[PDB]
Amino acid sequence: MDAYSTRPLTLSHGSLEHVLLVPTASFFIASQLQEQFNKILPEPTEGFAADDEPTTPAELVGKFLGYVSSLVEPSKVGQFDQVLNLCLTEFENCYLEGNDIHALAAKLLQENDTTLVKTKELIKNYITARIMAKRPFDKKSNSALFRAVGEGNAQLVAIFGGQGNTDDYFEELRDLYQTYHVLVGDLIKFSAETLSELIRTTLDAEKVFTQGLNILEWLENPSNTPDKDYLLSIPISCPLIGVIQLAHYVVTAKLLGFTPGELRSYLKGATGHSQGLVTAVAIAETDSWESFFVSVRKAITVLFFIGVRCYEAYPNTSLPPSILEDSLENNEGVPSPMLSISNLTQEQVQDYVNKTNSHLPAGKQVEISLVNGAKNLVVSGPPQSLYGLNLTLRKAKAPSGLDQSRIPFSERKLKFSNRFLPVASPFHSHLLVPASDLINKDLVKNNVSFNAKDIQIPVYDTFDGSDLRVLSGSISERIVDCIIRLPVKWETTTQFKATHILDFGPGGASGLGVLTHRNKDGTGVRVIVAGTLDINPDDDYGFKQXXXXXXXXXXXXXXXXXXXXXXXXXXXXX
Numbered sequence: 001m002d003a004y005s006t007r008p009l010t011l012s013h014g015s016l017e018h019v020l021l022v023p024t025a026s027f028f029i030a031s032q033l034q035e036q037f038n039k040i041l042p043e044p045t046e047g048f049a050a051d052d053e054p055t056t057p058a059e060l061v062g063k064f065l066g067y068v069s070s071l072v073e074p075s076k077v078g079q080f081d082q083v084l085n086l087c088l089t090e091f092e093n094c095y096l097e098g099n100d101i102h103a104l105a106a107k108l109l110q111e112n113d114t115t116l117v118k119t120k121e122l123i124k125n126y127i128t129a130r131i132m133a134k135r136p137f138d139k140k141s142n143s144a145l146f147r148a149v150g151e152g153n154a155q156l157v158a159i160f161g162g163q164g165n166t167d168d169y170f171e172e173l174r175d176l177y178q179t180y181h182v183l184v185g186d187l188i189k190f191s192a193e194t195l196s197e198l199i200r201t202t203l204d205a206e207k208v209f210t211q212g213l214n215i216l217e218w219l220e221n222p223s224n225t226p227d228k229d230y231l232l233s234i235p236i237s238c239p240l241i242g243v244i245q246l247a248h249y250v251v252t253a254k255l256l257g258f259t260p261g262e263l264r265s266y267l268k269g270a271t272g273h274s275q276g277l278v279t280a281v282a283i284a285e286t287d288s289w290e291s292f293f294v295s296v297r298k299a300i301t302v303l304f305f306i307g308v309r310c311y312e313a314y315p316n317t318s319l320p321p322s323i324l325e326d327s328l329e330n331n332e333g334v335p336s337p338m339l340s341i342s343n344l345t346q347e348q349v350q351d352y353v354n355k356t357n358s359h360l361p362a363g364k365q366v367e368i369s370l371v372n373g374a375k376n377l378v379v380s381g382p383p384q385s386l387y388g389l390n391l392t393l394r395k396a397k398a399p400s401g402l403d404q405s406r407i408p409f410s411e412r413k414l415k416f417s418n419r420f421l422p423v424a425s426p427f428h429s430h431l432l433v434p435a436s437d438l439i440n441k442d443l444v445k446n447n448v449s450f451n452a453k454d455i456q457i458p459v460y461d462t463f464d465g466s467d468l469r470v471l472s473g474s475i476s477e478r479i480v481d482c483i484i485r486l487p488v489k490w491e492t493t494t495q496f497k498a499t500h501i502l503d504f505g506p507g508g509a510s511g512l513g514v515l516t517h518r519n520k521d522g523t524g525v526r527v528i529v530a531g532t533l534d535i536n537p538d539d540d541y542g543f544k545q546x547x548x549x550x551x552x553x554x555x556x557x558x559x560x561x562x563x564x565x566x567x568x569x570x571x572x573x574x
Contacts, residue, residue: 001026003057005038005050009094011061014086021083028068029061045113050121052113058091059125066129073133081133088135091126099143100546101126102255105532119532120179131182140257143548149266154499157269157524158283160245160276161503163237163338164511167422170218170231172507173244176530177219183254184247190293191243191300192216198304202442205308208235215240233316233424238307242279242299245504248529249283252504255545260286260295264456269496271460273372273512274427274483276505278302281468281479285454298448302479307425309439310484314431316424317383327387330394335387336420338369338380338427343417349377356389367430372490373518380426390418432484439484440477451475462488465495491519500552501526514539522557 001011001022013019033049040047050060062084069080096104105119131137148154166172177188192215199205199213211226213236218225225231253263264270264286272280282299286292319335327335341349349368357365366381366389380386398413426432443449451474458467462482468475494516501524505511513528517539528541544552566574 003061004030005034005057006042007051007054007057009055009057011058011087012090014083018083018086021079025061025065025083029064031064034060050118052115052118053108054112055095056118056122058087058094059122062087062091062129063125066125066132069129069132075133084129084132085134088129099548100255102532102543102546103143103548106534106543109532109534116533120175124179124181127183128181137183137254138257140262142256143546145544145547145551146256146266148499148551149268155497156267157496157498157501158249158267158271158280159269159501159503159505159512159516160242160272160279160283161505161512162241162273162275163421163423163427164506164508165421166507166510167232167334168507169237169422170225170240172530173240173247174219174222176244176247179530180251183251186289187243187247187250187296188219191239191246191296194297194300195239195304198301201446202305202308205235208308208311211236230424232422234311235304235307237424238275238303239300241275241506242303244506245276245279245529246283246296246299248504249279252502252529252545259288260292261288267457269460269498269501270457271465271493273490273493273505274462274488275303275306276512277459277462277479277483278306279504280459281451281475284456284459294448298451301446301448302443302476305439305442306480306483309435309442310425310427310432313429313433313435314382314426319383323384323387327390330390330418332387332390332418332420334420334422335383336423337383337386337425338378338423339386339390339418339420341377341379341393341416341418342373343375343415344377345375346371346377349379352389352392353379356385356392360385360388363431365430367428368487369426369428370488370490371492372488372512372515374491376515376518378421380429382426382431386420393418427483428485428487436480436484440480443476443480449474449476451479460493460496462486462493465493490516494519496524498524500524502529503527504529507531509533509539509541513541522555522560525552525554527552 001013001019003009003011014022037047037049038051041051046052050056065080065084069084070076075081092098095107101123105123108115108119108122149156177184195213195215199209211230231237249260249263253260256263260283264284270280270284272278278299282295282302286295323335327333346368353366353368364382364385366379366385368377369380370376370378372378379389396414397416400415403412453469455467455469460466461468463486501516503511503513503516503526505513505528508531509528513526517524517526526539527544528539530542532542534540540552568574
């Protein structure tokens with residue numbers, strides 16, 4: 001054949017029995033919106049919708065067809081259940097050669113049209129078309145960049161973040177659901193039902209989800225998707241969050257042709273962050289997709305109840321405009337009860353904290369929320385107070401106006417960053433405890449709150465990396481106080497013997513995925529999940545999954561080229 005639109009891609013004339021049920025796709029693919037969307041390309045070269053890359057036609061044809069296809073795995077007969085397969089492999093022999101479509105994605109971000117949405121669609125086309133009828137994801141065998149931890153050449157670790165630096169949340173899950181219809185309708189539809197139940201069951205939780213938690217439709221037709229605001233509030237955010245990372249670990253799986261066991265396998269680490277730990281745990285021990293399921297039920301109800309209850313502590317207090325203004329001028333912004341005091345030191349971060357509480361009543365006082373990074377140091381307390389710290393915080397801070405230009409270090413002043421984060425609640429707090437213990441019980445109160453010695457790999461703690469298995473606390477009683485009470489000291493939670501780190505951190509290159517990197521510069525090669533974008537071989541991600549003939553190696557600062565010695569062919573040192 002010949003996928004048109006000014007760009008040609010031969011489609012081996014199926015010869016007769018094919019070429020007949022083919023043009024039925026030839027003109028249907030000539031879907032009116034392809035010709036006028038091809039006229040926006042003879043000049044505005046592939047303005048939009050398809051065509052981008054010369055071999056991208058194979059996309060929509062091998063997509064549109066891969067959909068109006070069988071419309072059920074139970075073959076809608078050869079019509080669209082074989083005609084679709086002559087081409088499927090036909091595609092797997094153009095510019096992919098196995099290696100995985102996700103990898104052929106790189107062959108776009110850098111080569112031709114630097115487009116994201118034009119590549120994301122591209123994937124969905126494949127993966128979906130593939131699982132539509134024959135060729136299901138299973139073959140198990142993978143390229144490389146993964147043999148490593150299996151041949152002893154490397155070691156892998158896993159991590160999961162939370163309330164990561166993103167005011168989107170759902171903007172990831174939707175753009176995760178839509179992305180791969182196939183590879184997650186499960187966890188999705190599943191967790192859907194799941195949460196949809198954990199409501200009527202905790203009768204009282206119905207007064208905390210004003211915005212119907214019908215996380216279902218929210219995807220298909222966001223037309224009535226409950227705000228952008230409260231879609232973030234703790235109950236509802238907590239769950240869907242893991243859902244994401246879980247969904248990924250899944251895709252990470254299903255893709256890789258494995259099973260949650262085939263993955264809890266190649267590993268050794270797996271350590272989440274606060275709302276990200278709950279994921280690590282429930283992820284450690286998971287075998288086939290038969291066990292893998294209720295396995296999720298856990299995590300879900302977990303974060304679920306944490307949120308639901310934590311929300312009943314000191315929920316979203318009606319923020320005062322009296323401040324919204326002033327705060328929005330210094331540009332600190334979203335007053336949010338949690339702050340990121342970057343570029344500085346603890347104690348320093350402390351001192352300030354101190355003096356503030358000093359005069360401040362006990363209840364409104366504030367703690368040093370996190371300790372991720374050697375500098376970074378999130379803090380939190382009632383929405384208010386926090387800013388009141390920013391007060392003294394500002395005055396002392398320097399406007400970034402040249403001062404070193406003429407002798408600094410001695411008199412020169414400091415530099416900051418006092419912004420807040422996308423987090424309705426004050427995790428790890430001094431007010432998120434009276435309800436803490438309750439969730440512990442709220443756990444058992446639902447025949448699933450366990451996490452026994454089934455601890456596959458060593459899932460490091462929120463405080464001091466211990467296999468988390470030292471019992472005497474059920475874990476599902478620590479994975480509570482380590483969150484809604486105790487700090488994180490992350491640098492202390494890392495102390496890994498890794499070569500890489502897989503972070504299904506909560507959407508984009510801003511959810512620990514990179515921070516973890518920050519702290520260390522000459523060790524792992526931290527790679528993340530969703531998102532295909534790149535940079536400069538620093539923290540390669542999203543595509544380092546199905547990579548073939550390309551291994552990660554973030555040079556070690558000492559090992560990598562360290563002092564040496566040698567002598568001359570005439571006997572001389574050097």
